[PDB]
Amino acid sequence: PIITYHSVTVPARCSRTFITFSDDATFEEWFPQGRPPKVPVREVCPVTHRPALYRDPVTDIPYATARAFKIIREAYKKYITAHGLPPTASALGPGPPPPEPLPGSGPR
């Protein structure tokens, strides 16, 4: 029994509550506590950048536009062989203007 209430008033004259959970195991299922990730990873499209939209496809990694989706699906046909050339090194013109240069679009 978890003892929902216990008040005694004894000291200044006062009034308190002393909840006594008992049974050991009852404590943590009433106080599991928490440690969530405060923020997520901010996702960026591999193709032309900007924040990600929709989600990942049925496989692989997220995208921003239908054109990015089209390039990503034209990609990954170069990689299902599990061998070959670089599938993503500047593949299909994946938003190539370098104010700051870009790696290949192979984060998966």
């Binding site: 005694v8 008992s22 928490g34 997520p40």
Partner: protein, 440 residues
């Protein structure tokens, strides 16, 4: 732009600091004695000492007696209630005539409720129980506090709450990252959602990732809401609790008006007085305006005898244009203004006069300015002659058609020819009535 009505040019009574009437100010011209009297009436209303004192505005048609009542509303501002009604509105199919009057008497009495509360809110981060082992006896493990840490925008703070909150806490099903609401007097927890930091390209939830609040973690909120006594009567008369079947039964059967009893009025007056004494509420007695009061029945007037004698009642303004006319509800009883003498002894009468041609011309110019119309001097003089011949209101009505006619002809202002054409396309009541002898 906002739409232009008949009395939109009226902005006040146009009185001096001494209360004397300017010849032309605040959209009104003339009626200096009546406007001075209305000045006295607005002072009476602002004093808030009096209940049930009544005023009658009497005079011929077109003398602006309706405008003076609306000028009284403008001087009082939006704080003071002003309830307009027509005498013909008492004839309802749902409730008796005297109930309609009492509903409008109560609508004119206002109340500002200034309740205050102090709260704590933000993103929960701890859910941390304290511990002191034993409650001075045979023991398992005892907590003695619950540490709750909130952070919203300005900072972070830890609160060591009463242990009793824990029951309510998982009743609300809170976890770390949620955002909550707790009231100081009661300690009652309420979950608002969880922060937008776990959102922004996640979406897909009916709870809504409610955004992380702004401001300090601890807040004192002062809410002011304006409400009438009739609103309190209507709200307290009904069983609004959805947990009862008859409440949702009320949805299907029609929620008609009902004849509210005096017991509810008395109890609401009692609790309103208690709120006023305790300082949570402020009373704002207002004005009831009954235009076309001659349409009321003898029963309505005889009820107003009692209603105006109440200590609760508001200031009432009546308006009529009838002469020595038969009282409605009686067979053959004539009385001045279509009103019984017994009620007429209970009111102070404000007389309104017919306007001179210069005053008509000035009002026409004001209305032309209000309607965004440019009119030449000879056109204005001819329109004033028309208003002298027929009626002020008829001449005022010709401005907009003449402006449209000028716009059709490419001109930017009204000349005499346009008003001349409009005066033959359209007829006044007197001219048409003379024509009725010709066309039978």
């Amino acid at each position: 732009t906002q739409r232009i009505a008949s009395h939109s040019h009226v902005k006040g009574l146009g009185l001096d600091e001494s209360g004397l009437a300017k010849q032309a100010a605040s959209g009104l011209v003339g009626q200096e004695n009546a406007r001075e009297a209305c000045g006295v009436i607005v002072e009476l209303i602002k004093s808030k000492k009096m209940a049930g004192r009544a005023v009658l505005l009497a005079g011929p048609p077109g003398t602006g007696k309706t405008a003076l009542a609306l000028a009284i509303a403008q001087e009082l501002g939006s704080k003071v209630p002003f309830c307009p009604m027509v005498g013909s509105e008492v004839y309802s199919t749902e409730i008796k005539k005297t109930e309609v009057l009492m509903e409008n008497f109560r609508r004119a009495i206002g109340l500002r409720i200034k309740e205050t509360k102090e709260v704590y809110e933000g993103e929960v981060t701890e859910l941390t129980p304290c511990e002191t082992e034993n409650p001075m006896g045979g023991y398992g493990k005892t907590i003695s506090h619950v540490i709750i840490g909130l952070k919203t925008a300005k900072g972070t703070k830890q609160l060591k709450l009463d242990p009793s909150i824990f029951e309510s806490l998982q009743k609300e099903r809170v976890e770390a990252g949620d955002v909550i609401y707790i009231e100081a007097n009661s300690g009652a927890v309420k979950r608002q959602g969880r922060c937008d930091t776990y959102a922004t390209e996640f979406d897909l939830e009916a709870e809504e990732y409610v955004p992380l609040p702004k401001g300090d973690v601890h807040k004192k909120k002062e809410i002011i809401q304006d409400v009438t006594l009739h609103d309190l009567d209507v709200a307290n008369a009904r069983p609004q609790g959805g947990q009862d079947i008859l409440s949702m039964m009320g949805q299907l059967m029609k929620p008609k008006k009902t004849e509210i009893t005096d017991k509810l009025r008395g109890e609401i007056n009692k609790v309103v007085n208690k709120y006023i004494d305790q300082g949570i509420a402020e009373l704002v007695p207002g004005v009831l305006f009954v235009d076309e009061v001659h349409m009321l029945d003898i029963e309505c007037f005889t009820y107003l005898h009692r209603a105006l004698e109440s200590s609760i009642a508001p200031i009432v303004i009546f308006a009529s244009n009838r002469g020595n006319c038969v009282i409605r509800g009686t067979e053959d009883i004539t009385s001045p203004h279509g009103i019984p003498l017994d009620l007429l002894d209970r009111v102070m009468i404000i007389r309104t006069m017919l306007y001179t041609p210069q005053e008509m011309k000035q009002i026409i110019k004001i209305r032309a300015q209000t309607e965004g119309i440019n009119i030449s001097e000879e056109a204005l003089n001819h329109l004033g002659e028309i208003g002298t011949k027929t009626t002020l209101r008829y001449s005022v009505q010709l401005l907009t058609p003449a402006n449209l006619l000028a716009k059709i002809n490419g001109k930017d202002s009204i000349e005499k020819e346009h008003v001349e054409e409009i005066s033959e396309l359209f007829y006044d009541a007197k001219s048409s009535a003379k024509i009725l002898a010709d066309q039978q």
